[PDB]
Amino acid sequence: SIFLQEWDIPFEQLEIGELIGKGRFGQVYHGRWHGEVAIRLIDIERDNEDQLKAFKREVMAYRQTRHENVVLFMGACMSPPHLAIITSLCKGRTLYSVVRDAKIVLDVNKTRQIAQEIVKGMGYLHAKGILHKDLKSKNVFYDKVVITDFGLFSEDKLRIQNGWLCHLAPEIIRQLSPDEDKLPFSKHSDVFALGTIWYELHAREWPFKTQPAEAIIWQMGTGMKPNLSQIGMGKEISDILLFCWAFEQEERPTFTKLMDMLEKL
Amino acid sequence: LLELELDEQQRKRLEAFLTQKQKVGELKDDDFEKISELGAGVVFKVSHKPSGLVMARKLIHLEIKPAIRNQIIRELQVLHECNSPYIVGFYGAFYSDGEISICMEHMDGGSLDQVLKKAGRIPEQILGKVSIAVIKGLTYLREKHKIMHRDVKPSNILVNSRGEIKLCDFGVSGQLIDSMANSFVGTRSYMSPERLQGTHYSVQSDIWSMGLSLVEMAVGRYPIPPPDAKELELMFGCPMAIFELLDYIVNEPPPKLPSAVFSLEFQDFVNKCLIKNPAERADLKQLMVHAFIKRSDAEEVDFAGWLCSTIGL
Numbered sequence: 001s002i003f004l005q006e007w008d009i010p011f012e013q014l015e016i017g018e019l020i021g022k023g024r025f026g027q028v029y030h031g032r033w034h035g036e037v038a039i040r041l042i043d044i045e046r047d048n049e050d051q052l053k054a055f056k057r058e059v060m061a062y063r064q065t066r067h068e069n070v071v072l073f074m075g076a077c078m079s080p081p082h083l084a085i086i087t088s089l090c091k092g093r094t095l096y097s098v099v100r101d102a103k104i105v106l107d108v109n110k111t112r113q114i115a116q117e118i119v120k121g122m123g124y125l126h127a128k129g130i131l132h133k134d135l136k137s138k139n140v141f142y143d144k145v146v147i148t149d150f151g152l153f154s155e156d157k158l159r160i161q162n163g164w165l166c167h168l169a170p171e172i173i174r175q176l177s178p179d180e181d182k183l184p185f186s187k188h189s190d191v192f193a194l195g196t197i198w199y200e201l202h203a204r205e206w207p208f209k210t211q212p213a214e215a216i217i218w219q220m221g222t223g224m225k226p227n228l229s230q231i232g233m234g235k236e237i238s239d240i241l242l243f244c245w246a247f248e249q250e251e252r253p254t255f256t257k258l259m260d261m262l263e264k265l
Numbered sequence: 266l267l268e269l270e271l272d273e274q275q276r277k278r279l280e281a282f283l284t285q286k287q288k289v290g291e292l293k294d295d296d297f298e299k300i301s302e303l304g305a306g307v308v309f310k311v312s313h314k315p316s317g318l319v320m321a322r323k324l325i326h327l328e329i330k331p332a333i334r335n336q337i338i339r340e341l342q343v344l345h346e347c348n349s350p351y352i353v354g355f356y357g358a359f360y361s362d363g364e365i366s367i368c369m370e371h372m373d374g375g376s377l378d379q380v381l382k383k384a385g386r387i388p389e390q391i392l393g394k395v396s397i398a399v400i401k402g403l404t405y406l407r408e409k410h411k412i413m414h415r416d417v418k419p420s421n422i423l424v425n426s427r428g429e430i431k432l433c434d435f436g437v438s439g440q441l442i443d444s445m446a447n448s449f450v451g452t453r454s455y456m457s458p459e460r461l462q463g464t465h466y467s468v469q470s471d472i473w474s475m476g477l478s479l480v481e482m483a484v485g486r487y488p489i490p491p492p493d494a495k496e497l498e499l500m501f502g503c504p505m506a507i508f509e510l511l512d513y514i515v516n517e518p519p520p521k522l523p524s525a526v527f528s529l530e531f532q533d534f535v536n537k538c539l540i541k542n543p544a545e546r547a548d549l550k551q552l553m554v555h556a557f558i559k560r561s562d563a564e565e566v567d568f569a570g571w572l573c574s575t576i577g578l
């Protein structure tokens with residue numbers, strides 16, 4: 001029960017465009033909230049009329065957030081049947097796609113810069129006390145560098161998708177077959193997920209590039225972090241990579257301490 | 266152009282499969298007339314109007330661009346030369362506006378997974394024939410196509426009313442598995458202990474699967490975790506986290522066939538498959554000539570007989 005008028009951004013005419021959204025949660029259309037935005041339609045599941053803190057307190061809090069490293073939250077609207085979330089359309093390329101684009105230079109400093117931003121944004125969301133949970137690589141865009149699709153967790157025998165499995169910290173990787181939300185998602189959950197994106201930046205591919213699902217689960221479960229030094233490698237980088245992946249979620253750096261290290265080279 | 270060692274009667278059956286395959290040219294989605302649903306993880310018992318036949322068909326959502334499908338079908342074509350009494354012979358492969366459709370032989374008896382549900386527990390005498398067929402099947406693949414099953418489940422061992430036993434769902438399309446990675450996991454595994462750790466999955470990996478599957482066949486329950494004390498106590502007649510199940514598979518001792526209820530010969534068999542160390546595990550040879558295999562091969566069993574005396578038809 002929420003309407004577009006309850007949002008800062010002035011809305012009068014919102015028109016949908018051509019679908020561009022595969023994704024797990026709903027479909028994403030290249031729409032027009034007057035301007036050029038991206039509309040996600042997550043048609044509501046039946047019943048469950050007891051999710052106030054879930055949105056009556058959550059989504060509305062995404063208002064009053066505004067950072068140069070976070071996608072603009074245009075606003076959403078929960079109807080009885082459906083649900084729709086609007087958001088600034090990023091006019092660029094996903095970090096996933098570019099980090100794999102047919103040969104792009106990207107140094108180690110051009111790498112540091114990418115990481116600088118991602119953590120600046122995540123830091124912001126931290127202070128606002130809002131967990132990203134799903135910080136994939138495919139959820140970063142390049143206009144500068146923009147985070148997106150944070151806090152999106154509101155289907156029979158566990159369907160594990162792509163490299164998503166290699167972003168989940170140990171605490172989480174021990175998951176039920178039914179159960180998809182309400183896992184040990186911590187603020188450390190997020191810092192861990194960042195680590196894997198960092199590896200990605202340097203290795204131009206994400207960890208366990210070849211292992212099956214069950215393999216990742218058990219490997220990452222026993223805390224079996226993949227190699228670091230492989231010609232070419234480099235100290236400094238190698239170090240920070242482990243910190244983010246520390247098996248004990250306590251031993252992991254906070255985004256603000258990680259931003260410091262990030263600036264030392 | 267042919268093959269070595271073939272049963273007189275099987276040479277009949279397989280020969281018909283070919284003559285009836287030459288009847289079908291292309292693969293029109295319209296020619297197929299949906300009939301009844303079968304399984305999912307999706308297969309339909311459809312019927313080909315032109316060839317006036319009833320063949321089994323599988324297909325799963327795949328919004329892959331036209332550029333991709335052409336290569337997938339190319340690799341998928343290999344299935345043609347993959348004809349054996351111990352393999353579910355296929356027909357062809359095609360797209361469908363947004364999905365790949367594999368057409369293959371229809372085993373009316375369903376996968377052993379289904380049969381194991383409508384029987385509770387499967388007799389050892391039978392598992393012998395099954396074990397044999399499976400071993401010969403996997404043997405055929407590796408020897409004649411260098412291909413290994415890669416995915417051995419009771420849900421992939423098809424058995425028709427002919428008392429026939431054939432394998433299916435074996436990975437033959439490399440490029441396909443790329444998009445076909447990132448998928449369902451579930452609560453029951455068959456990954457050999459070496460895989461979970463990283464070791465390349467030899468054909469012995471499928472052996473572990475077979476071994477594990479076999480156990481599930483007899484006890485009528487997914488072996489791990491092994492039954493309690495009162496559980497197994499009350500089984501003879503006539504809720505975990507994914508990582509925990511896996512971690513168990515890796516460190517804890519494998520499943521064992523309950524002594525007394527099964528021949529020691531047979532026990533040794535499954536035991537030789539569930540050896541957690543790849544190298545130390547039995548190869549498709551040791552098994553092919555194992556005391557158990559030797560016995561069941563001569564063991565006169567009215568397979569199809571009792572078969573249709575449990576699931577009927």
Ligand SMILES: Nc1ncnc2c1ncn2[C@@H]1O[C@H](COP(=O)(O)OP(=O)(O)OP(=O)(O)O)[C@@H](O)[C@H]1O
Pocket residue numbers: 020021022023024025026028038071087088089090091094136138139148149
């Ligand atoms: N805020 C946005 N700005 C621009 N494009 C977006 C935005 N959100 C989604 N998209 C597009 O939608 C597509 C995928 O939608 P979605 O975000 O649901 O899944 P994803 O980002 O690919 O992650 P996953 O597929 O793992 O859920 C991407 O190709 C992306 O380009």
Ligand SMILES: Nc1ncnc2c1ncn2[C@@H]1O[C@H](COP(=O)(O)OP(=O)(O)OP(=O)(O)O)[C@@H](O)[C@H]1O
Pocket residue numbers: 303304305306307308321322323353369370371372373375376377378379416418420421423433434
């Ligand atoms: N060619 C076929 N003839 C008869 N039954 C079939 C055939 N192919 C599949 N089935 C039935 O479909 C079920 C399995 O379907 P499907 O292959 O989609 O999933 P699965 O084999 O259980 O899992 P996976 O595909 O991951 O191995 C089995 O119970 C089997 O009886």
Ligand SMILES: [Cl-]
Pocket residue numbers: 544545546548
């Ligand atoms: Cl050996």
Ligand SMILES: [Mg+2]
Pocket residue numbers: 023138139149
């Ligand atoms: Mg997303």
Ligand SMILES: [Mg+2]
Pocket residue numbers: 376420421422433434
């Ligand atoms: Mg099957």
